[PDB]
Design an enzyme around this catalytic site. Structure first.
Site, PDB file in Angstrom:
ATOM      1  N   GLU A 194     -53.545 -51.619 -53.633  1.00 48.12           N
ATOM      2  CA  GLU A 194     -52.818 -52.018 -52.429  1.00 48.12           C
ATOM      3  C   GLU A 194     -53.178 -51.073 -51.303  1.00 48.12           C
ATOM      4  O   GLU A 194     -53.385 -51.499 -50.159  1.00 48.12           O
ATOM      5  CB  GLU A 194     -51.304 -52.000 -52.653  1.00 48.12           C
ATOM      6  CG  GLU A 194     -50.801 -53.030 -53.658  1.00 48.12           C
ATOM      7  CD  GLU A 194     -49.259 -52.879 -53.883  1.00 48.12           C
ATOM      8  OE1 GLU A 194     -48.755 -53.004 -55.023  1.00 48.12           O
ATOM      9  OE2 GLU A 194     -48.556 -52.612 -52.892  1.00 48.12           O
TER      10      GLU A 194
ATOM     11  N   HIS B 151     -48.552 -58.124 -51.271  1.00 52.73           N
ATOM     12  CA  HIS B 151     -47.873 -58.712 -52.429  1.00 52.73           C
ATOM     13  C   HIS B 151     -48.647 -58.311 -53.728  1.00 52.73           C
ATOM     14  O   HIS B 151     -49.877 -58.460 -53.806  1.00 52.73           O
ATOM     15  CB  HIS B 151     -47.788 -60.241 -52.302  1.00 52.73           C
ATOM     16  CG  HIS B 151     -47.106 -60.904 -53.470  1.00 52.73           C
ATOM     17  ND1 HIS B 151     -45.740 -61.034 -53.556  1.00 52.73           N
ATOM     18  CD2 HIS B 151     -47.611 -61.419 -54.610  1.00 52.73           C
ATOM     19  CE1 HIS B 151     -45.425 -61.641 -54.688  1.00 52.73           C
ATOM     20  NE2 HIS B 151     -46.541 -61.865 -55.360  1.00 52.73           N
TER      21      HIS B 151
ATOM     22  N   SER C 278     -45.188 -45.761 -50.181  1.00 56.60           N
ATOM     23  CA  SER C 278     -46.576 -45.379 -50.467  1.00 56.60           C
ATOM     24  C   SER C 278     -47.563 -46.261 -49.659  1.00 56.60           C
ATOM     25  O   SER C 278     -48.606 -45.774 -49.197  1.00 56.60           O
ATOM     26  CB  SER C 278     -46.889 -45.451 -51.977  1.00 56.60           C
ATOM     27  OG  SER C 278     -47.006 -46.793 -52.411  1.00 56.60           O
TER      28      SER C 278
HETATM   29  N1  LIG Z   1     -42.539 -59.038 -52.586  1.00 58.16           N
HETATM   30  C1  LIG Z   1     -43.158 -57.862 -52.005  1.00 58.16           C
HETATM   31  C2  LIG Z   1     -43.397 -56.770 -53.037  1.00 58.16           C
HETATM   32  O1  LIG Z   1     -43.161 -56.936 -54.239  1.00 58.16           O
HETATM   33  N2  LIG Z   1     -43.876 -55.639 -52.544  1.00 58.16           N
HETATM   34  C3  LIG Z   1     -44.318 -54.563 -53.423  1.00 58.16           C
HETATM   35  O2  LIG Z   1     -43.375 -53.504 -53.401  1.00 58.16           O
HETATM   36  C4  LIG Z   1     -44.012 -52.235 -53.581  1.00 58.16           C
HETATM   37  C5  LIG Z   1     -43.538 -51.312 -52.468  1.00 58.16           C
HETATM   38  O3  LIG Z   1     -44.074 -50.002 -52.686  1.00 58.16           O
HETATM   39  P1  LIG Z   1     -44.078 -48.857 -51.525  1.00 58.16           P
HETATM   40  O4  LIG Z   1     -42.668 -48.829 -50.945  1.00 58.16           O
HETATM   41  O5  LIG Z   1     -44.492 -47.610 -52.284  1.00 58.16           O
HETATM   42  O6  LIG Z   1     -45.122 -49.316 -50.497  1.00 58.16           O
HETATM   43  C6  LIG Z   1     -45.503 -52.496 -53.419  1.00 58.16           C
HETATM   44  O7  LIG Z   1     -46.105 -52.631 -54.689  1.00 58.16           O
HETATM   45  C7  LIG Z   1     -45.527 -53.879 -52.802  1.00 58.16           C
HETATM   46  O8  LIG Z   1     -46.726 -54.609 -53.043  1.00 58.16           O
END
Ligand SMILES: NCC(=O)N[C@@H]1O[C@H](COP(=O)([O-])[O-])[C@@H](O)[C@H]1O
Ligand SMILES: Nc1nc2[nH]c(CCNc3ccc(C(=O)N[C@@H](CCC(=O)O)C(=O)O)cc3)cc2c(=O)[nH]1
EC number: 6.3.4.13
Length: 200
Positions: free
Chosen positions: A173, A108, A12
């Site tokens: 994010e 993060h 996402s």
């Molecule tokens: N330590 C890094 C961490 O926790 N990252 C977190 O993983 C998720 C990935 O979502 P996505 O694959 O839908 O972008 C996101 O919330 C990101 O901030």
């Protein structure tokens, strides 16, 4: 500026970066998406957008350095200027981080310095904060400790779980990661010689 986005899953954040970087005034173009895991949804999102993908399985490498080395080769192949870690769940080695110093960003899902590490929402819920949020930062060798570029706060609601809180935080994010990418690609913000953030 030419960008590589590294992912480990849903994608996402990748999708939000794809949408922002296709706006006419975008100073960034995404040229390659790299996953360390096969068959994840972020790879589909990249292909639908016409962006090349590579899978580089960390489980096939002796150590971190060799793995990062295989990533760096792809990065050079596509003449990359900036790397975004977008749900990428591996710790990167020291020399890889040194090489891309000032040129690699991470998202993060907490307000750093609180709740560093890979389970930020679980920590936030266990601690009982009523405000959490997310952070985009430059990647330094010390994990989740690099220089902070943007942050956005997000309320915690009573009864929240990891599912409902991470959904709310992802909405924020998806705003600051494209804003931060545009700040760095345009040269508006850079890592300064003294190691602190510099707004130009
Ligand atoms: N330590 C890094 C961490 O926790 N990252 C977190 O993983 C998720 C990935 O979502 P996505 O694959 O839908 O972008 C996101 O919330 C990101 O901030
Ligand atoms: N040097 C450096 N690397 C970084 N990588 C990231 C990417 C995003 N943050 C992370 C922070 C901690 C972890 C972590 O516990 N990983 C385990 C894998 C967890 C597992 O599935 O069992 C590991 O890999 O063994 C992963 C990512 C930031 C970040 C950073 O700021 N600096």
């Amino acid at each position: 500026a030419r960008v590589a986005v590294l992912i480990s899953g849903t994608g996402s954040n990748l999708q939000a970066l794809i949408d922002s970087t296709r706006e006419p005034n975008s100073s960034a173009q995404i040229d390659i998406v790299i996953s360390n895991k096969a068959a994840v949804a972020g790879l589909d999102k990249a292909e639908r957008a016409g962006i090349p993908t590579r899978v580089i399985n960390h489980k096939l490498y002796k150590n971190r350095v060799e793995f990062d080395s295989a990533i760096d080769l792809v990065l050079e192949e596509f003449s990359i200027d900036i790397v975004c870690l977008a749900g990428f769940m591996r710790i990167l080695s020291g020399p890889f981080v040194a090489k891309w110093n000032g040129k690699m960003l991470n998202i993060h899902p907490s307000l750093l310095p609180s709740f560093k590490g890979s389970n930020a929402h679980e920590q936030a819920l266990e601690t009982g904060v009523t405000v959490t949020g997310c952070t985009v930062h430059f990647v330094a060798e010390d994990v989740d400790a690099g220089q902070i570029i943007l942050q956005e706060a997000v309320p915690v609601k009573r009864g929240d779980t990891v599912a409902t809180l991470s959904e709310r935080v992802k909405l924020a994010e998806h705003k600051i990661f494209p804003a931060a990418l545009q700040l760095v690609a345009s040269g508006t913000v850079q890592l300064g010689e003294n190691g602190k953030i510099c707004w130009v």
